[PDB]
Amino acid sequence: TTNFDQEALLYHQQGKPGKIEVISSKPCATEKDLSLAYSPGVAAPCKAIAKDPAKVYDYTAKGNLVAVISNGTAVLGLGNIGPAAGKPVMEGKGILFKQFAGIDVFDIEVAATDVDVFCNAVRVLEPTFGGINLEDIKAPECFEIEERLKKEMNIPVFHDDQHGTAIVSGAALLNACSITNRKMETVRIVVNGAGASANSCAKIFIALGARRENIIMCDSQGVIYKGRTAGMNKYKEYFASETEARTLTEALRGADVFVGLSVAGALTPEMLKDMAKDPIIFAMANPEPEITPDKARAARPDAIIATGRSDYPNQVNNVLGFPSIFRGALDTRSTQINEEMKLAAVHALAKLAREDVPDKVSATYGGKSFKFGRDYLIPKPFDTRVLLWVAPEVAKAAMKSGVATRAIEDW
Amino acid sequence: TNFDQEALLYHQQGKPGKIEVISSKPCATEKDLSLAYSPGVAAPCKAIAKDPAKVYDYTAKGNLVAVISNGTAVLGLGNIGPAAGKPVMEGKGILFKQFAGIDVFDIEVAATDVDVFCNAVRVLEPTFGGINLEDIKAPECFEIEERLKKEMNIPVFHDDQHGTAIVSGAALLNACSITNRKMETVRIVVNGAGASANSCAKIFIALGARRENIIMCDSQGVIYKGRTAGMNKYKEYFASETEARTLTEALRGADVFVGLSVAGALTPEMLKDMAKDPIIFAMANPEPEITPDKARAARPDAIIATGRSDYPNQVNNVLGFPSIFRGALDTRSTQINEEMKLAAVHALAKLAREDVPDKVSATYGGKSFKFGRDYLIPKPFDTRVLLWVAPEVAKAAMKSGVATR
Ligand SMILES: NC(=O)c1ccc[n+]([C@@H]2O[C@H](COP(=O)([O-])OP(=O)(O)OC[C@H]3O[C@@H](n4cnc5c(N)ncnc54)[C@H](OP(=O)(O)O)[C@@H]3O)[C@@H](O)[C@H]2O)c1
Ligand SMILES: NC(=O)c1ccc[n+]([C@@H]2O[C@H](COP(=O)([O-])OP(=O)(O)OC[C@H]3O[C@@H](n4cnc5c(N)ncnc54)[C@H](OP(=O)(O)O)[C@@H]3O)[C@@H](O)[C@H]2O)c1
Ligand SMILES: [Mg+2]
Ligand SMILES: [Mg+2]
């Protein structure tokens, strides 16, 4: 819909260009005000921070400030459009941080595609920020970039395209498994796609109890089988499967779970018929899914379906993750977002969906009723319980794992 | 002091720090967010991919300045490091917002090597409409600003260097006018050879001063040609043929003293042998090279400006950078060049000759102001400044061809 596009263009240019403004949180009108905000008063917190570096969190915005950082090499589904073109998306990501977790964001678009240039530039920004959310950086560069920055920086570094997606889909999968009386240890999973998100999703499924041998990964050229060499790399190699299947169709034979992280249309009804009873179908290709819940329900009335879209039930929406994840990490002044923290967020999201849904949430969604089951197995994005459930569990995981530098006693 | 305690509480209370980032557009509903983020946010991205200039139409780039420091010369605190400088950079951003309506991301960078710092900062270009370098020590700051100006296609401006040059240059033009002087024959003595001093001398030459009429002194006295002690590439440029060796000897018959050094550096005896109607810029902080009363006591015909708000003629940098960047941003300029800097000088000098509104008088407690020896430049809280200076900078950018809008 190109007129919907025009609504978006107008939105971005109307009044003042763009979507963000930086304002003072303190009085700044009078000469007295400015004698505190600036010279000579501002020397006091500077001296305090020089003597005790931790006090940077007491006297600046650092403790609530995340950088959303991209080089614009994988923007949304638009591909490598460059950092300037990606800036609206990074401003938008920042707005989600603010609206869902109260976190201030500097969106930082970096003109560097070289891994060393990019990492060298970002590493030295640490004094500015309480955390770094890497965004829309293409695979496989994003794997090296994230791992290097996590090692080199002493503040949390988290690439949402990789792990946010894994966290929310993992939560959904745990619940889908519960609803269908499945054990993770025996569930057979097919992942369609082998990019930034598929890699992390596969890894978290294993972390949640799935076996590598029960997971088959497919790409643009079919099943990633052990021995294969076409279009292969270090990361695809890890998930190369001993299977005899070569097509997506073959891989789905008797499979329990389809995880779609590829492109629209990739999954048809015929492929659906041979899946196991109560098939679990996550069709997350944007903006159009691998399949529709209706086409899926038509082929398989017993199917459980999640997608990336808010107009269908069970949206695997990344906004369920990163805001609370950084809230918990920031509030404990943590030096990392580690695996313990990611898993804590999985389990918090999963558990929340199992609770009775307050009238407030139904009223937010037009009076729709929600109860845990096949049409509701992950929290709604506009449910205010999400921050309350996920952020403290992340904070507790940071303290338990020893990456917190500030204890939080209670909420 | 109670004031330090007040300052600490100001920073620590409420939301820690001094800045918040907010949405400038509606962002409460599913519909709102379908435009602010996916799927609608793809539209401006596609527009920008096709026509790069549209980044200025659809993002905050055109109103967004990075205040960037590695914390190596923070205020008068020296090399305290990037984190400890963060309160100062947040506060600088506050000034940008309050005086020019400019949004700032303060960026504290953990790199002291010129090369590493530059390589980290120049790739941030897509984010910003302009870069204000701040509180970076000399001589590294010269090399850094020079290199970034060569690499980046947005304005790069180190305020410590050029802000004081611009405002003191406006003050100097007016001082010369008042005392019937011509810049081409004025003899100037610059005390100090650091970040700000060097730029001051360069602005004076641009305003018509002759390089031969300028003597620069540092911690070891006059910088004379042939001297090697404590020299560098930048001091070398301003090395003088003069036989003077001390600040005292240099000031004999001098018209102007520009003090960018340390307190007490200027005594009354040096003042004695200055020319009639000596112009004295004592801008050392927090205590000037000499006080206004001690100066007029020695020389009653003296015209004096300082860096302090408690005396007349405050050479305050807030008179410069807000309008300079406002003008640069509004013309979507690729540079702040010498033409733009000079445009700011002349506009500031011109505003000072205008009648001072009661609003300004009221702002400063009924104190009247009329262009003269006690009023050489606009007051910092004069709201006319942005309206006067920024349009002149924009005109300069367009005339010199660095404007893209
Ligand atoms: N919460 C969500 O809804 C969510 C989150 C993240 C991602 N996604 C969606 O998942 C998709 C990929 O995201 P990404 O960040 O991972 O991108 P990516 O890094 O580019 O990954 C693309 C992957 O898809 C593979 N592929 C392309 N065509 C295929 C086909 N017909 N069949 C099977 N695989 C195919 C590609 O194979 P090759 O490697 O061989 O080229 C590649 O592995 C996008 O649509 C994204 O919108 C959704
Ligand atoms: N608008 C304003 O009010 C304003 C603006 C900018 C600066 N200032 C003030 O000017 C002074 C310099 O600032 P800056 O940033 O330029 O500092 P800077 O970079 O450190 O430069 C210091 C300069 O002062 C020289 N110096 C040290 N002691 C001296 C002495 N007794 N006599 C003469 N020169 C001496 C140094 O000489 P060596 O090279 O030999 O070390 C050096 O050249 C500071 O007090 C600053 O607060 C005021
Ligand atoms: Mg992303
Ligand atoms: Mg400064």
GROMACS .gro file of N, CA and C and ligand atoms in nm, chain A residues 38, chain B residues 73-75 88-89 92 132-136 158-161 317, ligand 4:
model
   52
   38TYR      N    1   2.609   2.385   3.384
   38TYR     CA    2   2.734   2.408   3.319
   38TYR      C    3   2.832   2.468   3.419
  484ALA      N    4   4.087   1.776   2.813
  484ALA     CA    5   4.099   1.913   2.865
  484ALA      C    6   3.963   1.964   2.910
  485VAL      N    7   3.911   1.907   3.018
  485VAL     CA    8   3.776   1.937   3.061
  485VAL      C    9   3.775   2.061   3.146
  486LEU      N   10   3.705   2.164   3.097
  486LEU     CA   11   3.702   2.292   3.166
  486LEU      C   12   3.845   2.331   3.199
  499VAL      N   13   2.997   1.758   3.172
  499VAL     CA   14   3.026   1.879   3.095
  499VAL      C   15   2.970   1.870   2.953
  500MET      N   16   2.980   1.753   2.889
  500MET     CA   17   2.927   1.741   2.753
  500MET      C   18   2.774   1.741   2.752
  503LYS      N   19   2.699   2.106   2.788
  503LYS     CA   20   2.721   2.175   2.661
  503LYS      C   21   2.599   2.154   2.571
  543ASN      N   22   3.052   1.914   1.707
  543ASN     CA   23   3.121   2.010   1.793
  543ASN      C   24   3.221   1.934   1.880
  544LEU      N   25   3.348   1.944   1.843
  544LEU     CA   26   3.455   1.893   1.928
  544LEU      C   27   3.466   1.983   2.050
  545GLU      N   28   3.495   1.923   2.165
  545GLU     CA   29   3.494   1.995   2.291
  545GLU      C   30   3.598   1.939   2.387
  546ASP      N   31   3.670   2.028   2.455
  546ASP     CA   32   3.756   1.988   2.568
  546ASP      C   33   3.855   1.875   2.535
  547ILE      N   34   3.925   1.894   2.424
  547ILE     CA   35   4.032   1.806   2.379
  547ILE      C   36   4.160   1.886   2.387
  569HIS      N   37   3.580   2.285   1.651
  569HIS     CA   38   3.624   2.270   1.791
  569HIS      C   39   3.602   2.401   1.867
  570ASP      N   40   3.502   2.405   1.954
  570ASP     CA   41   3.459   2.531   2.013
  570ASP      C   42   3.569   2.596   2.097
  571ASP      N   43   3.644   2.514   2.170
  571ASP     CA   44   3.753   2.570   2.251
  571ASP      C   45   3.850   2.649   2.165
  572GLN      N   46   3.871   2.604   2.042
  572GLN     CA   47   3.961   2.676   1.953
  572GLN      C   48   3.900   2.804   1.898
  728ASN      N   49   3.166   3.211   2.525
  728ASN     CA   50   3.158   3.127   2.405
  728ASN      C   51   3.014   3.097   2.364
  820MG      MG   52   3.536   2.373   2.591
   0.00000   0.00000   0.00000
